[PDB]
Design a protein around this ligand. Structure first.
Ligand SMILES: CC(O)N[C@H](CO)[C@@H](O)[C@H](O)[C@H](O)CO
Ligand SMILES: CC(O)N[C@H](CO)[C@@H](O)[C@H](O)[C@H](O)CO
Ligand SMILES: [Mn+2]
Ligand SMILES: [Mn+2]
Lengths: 348, 348
């Protein structure tokens, strides 16, 4: 589809590269470092390349009004939830160090100016901007000036709305990705709309395309890889028993491995062209294709026709079924036995 | 993508319909009715809708030359293999009756004129033409005149080659499907080229598009459903222990069920548009979107600016982050407390 690409550290991302799966524990650790470390351990052992976090600083990402609003996947204010799961600066710094001590790449999502500045201090290789901030241009402008590539989720936003952010990013001069997404926890299959990825790619030809997902399984993501997605994001947990509003739609070690295996197979199987000639098929063609044979005994001098000629496998005869009709009207240069392939020496 | 459709009995096929999985036991029964019945039983219990067979009549589908050619997935002549697995007419008639006694649809693939005529006598609802016969125009012409819809595999053939057959089909006036395919048993992921489906759909806009597959698993087919495939074909067996050249790439009860479940999820998740508004996302938008707040204490009379104004969740403030800049230069109609959302009554 395209050859757009950029790097997240030493990891190349793009259509012509192995798709990247981002394991986001997000707020899954419920504010506990011990839990966060156990989830990072699971991610490592499962074979994860990237672990994404969520950088929350309650007072800077939301005003008092947030103490009165409830998210769709919970029964208490988003403020209460965030004040409960948020890791302070020192703890998040240890989390990043720990992820990296496991040989994995650490990136996070800022939801405020203060968070962006903290992550800049930490010098992460790339910045993820959540669908909720996709239309938060002043914040996008700040992040873009950091000079690192941006992975922008586009849920809850139209192409035109997204256009403004992409313009700010290009202005900044940093490479970027666009992840189609639907922000319902969990998300039903009917709301996914994989076609949205093509809408994004056609609208922004220089963008790396992927999918951020919240369904209950891997189907959406596998479908995204088949469509050309280069980046895949699903929340992640060490085990599905855990409490938390995003746990239900999270993938675990076993499911991650399945997504990774399926992503590899689909990276290989996708795209290509119908007319491409595949050498491996030759022995099949040589026996399956039909050649022109005699449908009846034909005496020398008699005319060949669609009545005394037919076609049968294999494809080694002097005349291929594609040439069947060109033989009509020709003259038998000798007696032709029924069932025999028609050879060049059989006609005048 | 399109609304093309047609029926195989009472089963509607097309992009806007549940994708159809064709379980082809083909030659998997190794010529044994008992084995064929056991495989049909497995297909039934697994939840299969269609069972496809292969109608072989050795003397009519191939000349003596075939006794000297070996297929890629075997070590004996294709003639020997077919003479070994071929079911005579009476037995195949019992097979069709048995499939139907299980409430499933029976269709088959003819490889000769005699086979086509036998299946016409049996009055099957639709005809499958294998990739090997995709370029066998005289045979396609015969089948098309039967007045039933055609499912045409297109492996080993270019778009131009396929063009001739599609023309013959349209001429005949029957609806048809085009299954992208690669004929190597088994087929590696890299040879699949799912993009071939789009090449087929763009070249033949009135065709129902699907995929016939020979890889070792469901990934290719699941990818095809994500791309818009309406028909999926994989060889089928009751168990992977069975002997036979096509067994290795066949799906079994458990894998069929997986393909069927994944096909359903992907039918729901595919297509759609990026700009489509999803009601379920509203509660997320209401809390995640940012509103303009005061970044500092602003005294009445003072001018609002990008220095004393900022943005924070939630999205219920009088001014959305999208309107952030329009507030620049405005005059505070009263003292504005730091951290408070900017309201319409705060400016002159
Ligand atoms: C919109 C947003 O910030 N979503 C994030 C990332 O997907 C979620 O983790 C929410 O913070 C969470 O669902 C709130 O309960
Ligand atoms: C080309 C062809 O006829 N292929 C059929 C259907 O895919 C196969 O079943 C072969 O008859 C088989 O692989 C021969 O060994
Ligand atoms: Mn998410
Ligand atoms: Mn096949």
């Amino acid at each position: 589809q395209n050859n757009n690409e950029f790097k997240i550290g030493n990891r190349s991302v793009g259509y012509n590269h192995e798709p990247l799966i981002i394991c986001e524990i997000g707020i899954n650790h419920e504010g506990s470092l011990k839990t966060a470390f156990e989830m990072v351990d699971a991610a490592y052992n499962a074979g994860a390349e990237v672990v994404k976090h969520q950088t929350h600083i309650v007072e800077d990402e939301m005003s008092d009004e947030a103490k009165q609003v409830i998210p769709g996947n919970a029964d208490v204010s988003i403020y209460e939830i965030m004040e409960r799961c948020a890791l302070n600066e020192e703890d998040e710094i240890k989390l990043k160090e720990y992820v990296e001590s496991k040989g994995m790449i650490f990136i996070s999502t800022p939801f405020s100016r203060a968070a962006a500045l903290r992550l800049q201090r930490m010098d992460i290789p790339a910045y993820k901007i959540g669908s909720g901030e996709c239309n938060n241009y002043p914040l996008i402008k700040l992040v873009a000036s950091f000079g690192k590539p941006i992975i922008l989720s586009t849920g809850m936003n139209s192409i035109e709305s997204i256009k403004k952010s992409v313009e700010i990013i290009r202005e900044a001069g940093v490479p970027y990705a666009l992840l189609h997404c639907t922000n319902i926890y969990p998300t039903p299959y009917e709301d996914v709309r994989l076609g949205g990825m093509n809408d994004l790619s056609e609208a922004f030809p220089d963008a790396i395309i992927g999918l951020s997902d919240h369904t209950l399984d891997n189907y959406a993501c596998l479908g995204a890889v088949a469509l050309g997605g280069s980046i895949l994001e699903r929340h992640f947990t060490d085990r599905m028993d855990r409490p938390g509003p995003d746990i239900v739609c999270s993938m675990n070690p076993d499911t991650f491995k399945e997504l990774k295996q399926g992503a590899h197979a689909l990276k290989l199987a996708r795209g290509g062209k119908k007319d491409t000639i595949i050498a491996g098929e030759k022995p099949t063609k040589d026996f399956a294709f039909a050649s022109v044979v005699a449908d009846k005994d034909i005496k020398k001098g008699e005319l060949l026709s669609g009545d005394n000629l037919w076609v049968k496998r294999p494809g080694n005869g002097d005349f291929s079924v594609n040439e069947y009709e060109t033989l009509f009207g020709k003259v038998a240069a000798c007696n032709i036995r029924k069932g025999a392939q028609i050879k060049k020496t059989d006609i005048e």
